[model samples]
Target chain A: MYKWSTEVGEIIIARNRDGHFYINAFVNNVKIKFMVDTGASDIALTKEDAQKLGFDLTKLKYTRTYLENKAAPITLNSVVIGKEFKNIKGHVGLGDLDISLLGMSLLERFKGFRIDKDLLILNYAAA
Target chain B: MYKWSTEVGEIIIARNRDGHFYINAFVNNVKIKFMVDTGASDIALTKEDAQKLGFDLTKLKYTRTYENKAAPITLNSVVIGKEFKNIKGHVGLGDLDISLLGMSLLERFKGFRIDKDLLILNYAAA
Candidate 1:
């Protein structure tokens, strides 16, 4: 249960609850909710959500490796909202993940990001 | 400047980039860009960066503290689109690679969360 806000100044905003940012974002064409995890390297998706996004789960090959979970490597065509990022790399979670996480594959694009006063501020440029 | 909303149920969202989170905070009444470093006990200021606040470093003394020693100092105030006034902070004996944001200022707030590609902060408003 999370909500996402549209961009202002090409910026996206989210609310913090229980120390996690649950966000709904545009991945490919469909919208998906994700938790922001800077420590994670890939945008991890749960099995059901991957299926929900129209990926063939049965044909997916488990190639990406993590601490314990065996993952299926995948690529997102684009993540769109205020601005767009292309070819975001990530994986489908095999198990042990209940929700998708926003990872470095998408985050490490901007030079800087801000978290202030209950707001996640993403400006097109530094302000 | 970051855009602020009056709605209580709202938060600003951003996709993460570069694997690091940063914020422009007001330290000593000066806007400072800080790389998040909760690893630090307090705000770790670059000696040169601290000078930007125009404080007298001549009186600063390198006190025995932390793994690496630093000059003991207390900043008059710090703000991150919000105010965090009166804090104990430190200046490095030498220049640090970048200004590191420690837990001191962050701990003042009751909460923070990074949502995929985004960092979310919460405050109880009057």
Candidate 2:
């Protein structure tokens, strides 16, 4: 709720202490930090974040994928970002993933998105 | 600049207007935007960015595979951060994709890591 605003189908992001943009998301009801990457095709979380959500890290099946041609080993999970999105499929990174990601998989589900110098707008209706 | 800090093997990232983390990179010397995905192994650029970096999009060949379960792609060269790692990587995504920092290629060259919210790109022989 810090520098964040929301409407029926949109959420406004705010700048953090380091002046980097981030989003609000939840894993198994545990709110966490995530960075937006429109270039990514799927939502991704770090192993640590996944563990915090009560997942058995060693039990999930990891798969190797080339994200943007980069080798990525990921596992799938369910994520909820605010009330606008619930139980959306996401990927869990098995490496040294520092930032949780909100990628195209979730973005594409939304109707529209607008990026600016001080704001990011997400629209839920069809574009 | 703009809340960004750097060191010999580290680059401090700052939040953008949307409160999301991002990285500064260059393609063909043109400054561009990138979001880091440590889960990603190779660096990827958008079709728009690739062209801006002077790549001939139409000529690059894309390949599809089942083992890794990835979309068809081609290859090209990319420069990462001020550290300026000039690396070869995958091609563009037509016109509507954003670039990303892949750690696979980065980890291969050095002891790359992230801690205290800082991206540390280490040198293998330092």
Candidate 3:
């Protein structure tokens, strides 16, 4: 998924077998899959996924809205999503979700982004 | 939601307030809301949706696999944006929630993808 052209300052993540788009990332220095979700309010992790990285839901405070679903809040350390988003705010384990979501919280950081037919395009600031 | 940019062969559908993709469609020439679902097996209408359009599921045979049951229907016309197709669609036989704009219609596009908050369907030659 990282094999994108840097010339245009863009990275393209293609849809997976389930027809959902995903990009690889390191949240808090741990590698994980991020399903691109324009529907999400924050970068979100499945309860199962966050726990794999030693996230303790019991320790973190959760805020609710939608708000029926609750998620633990945290700030990711050294996160890299296509580009090094550096650090960003994110939520852990919203509910019965099976995978982590790369939400608008982080995606909004991109110069621009698009869902252009099977590809999730991340716009970058050209060097 | 039916707006088209045929000059470039593109039809753009933006995410609804719920922040999910939705595209308007004419299933069997009957108006219905189609929630875009890339994971669906066919263009699928919920039991409620089909019934609203006078679909009589009682008379149709259903196919089951994944052991999940669904009744298939041949739509008279499936139109979204600038594209149209005469295709087979499905009605959920059980507790299905949304009318899905599924692969039956999606596969006909030159290509389709999500960008930011938008679902872009490309049929550039159209």
**Model 2 chain A weakest lDDT span, ten residues long:** A1-10
Would candidate 3 be rated incorrect, acceptable, medium or high by CAPRI criteria? incorrect
lDDT of 2 by residue, A10-126 (tens): 466755567656876655567888887767777777877777876777767665554332233443444554334555666676556698877877766665667787766665421
| Per-model TM-score (chain A alone) | 0.79, 0.69, 0.77
| lDDT tens readout by residue for model 3, A1-127 | 0111122245777777798887788766688887778887678777777787787867877765444676678777767654577768777765787778888878878887778787777765422
Candidate 1's displacement at residue A91, Å, is 0.5
Best by TM-score: 1
Residue A5 of model 3, lDDT score: 15
Superposed by TM-score, candidate 2 places the C-alpha of residue A41 at a distance from the truth, in angstroms, of 1.3
Task: Please give the RMSD to the true structure for each candidate, in Å.
Answer: 18.3, 25.3, 22.1
Q: Model 1: runs farther than 4 Å from truth? A: A1-15, A116-118, A125-127, B1-126
Interface RMSD of 1: 12.8
Best by DockQ: 1
Q: Ranking by lDDT, best first?
A: 3, 1, 2
Whole-model lDDT per candidate = 0.69, 0.58, 0.70
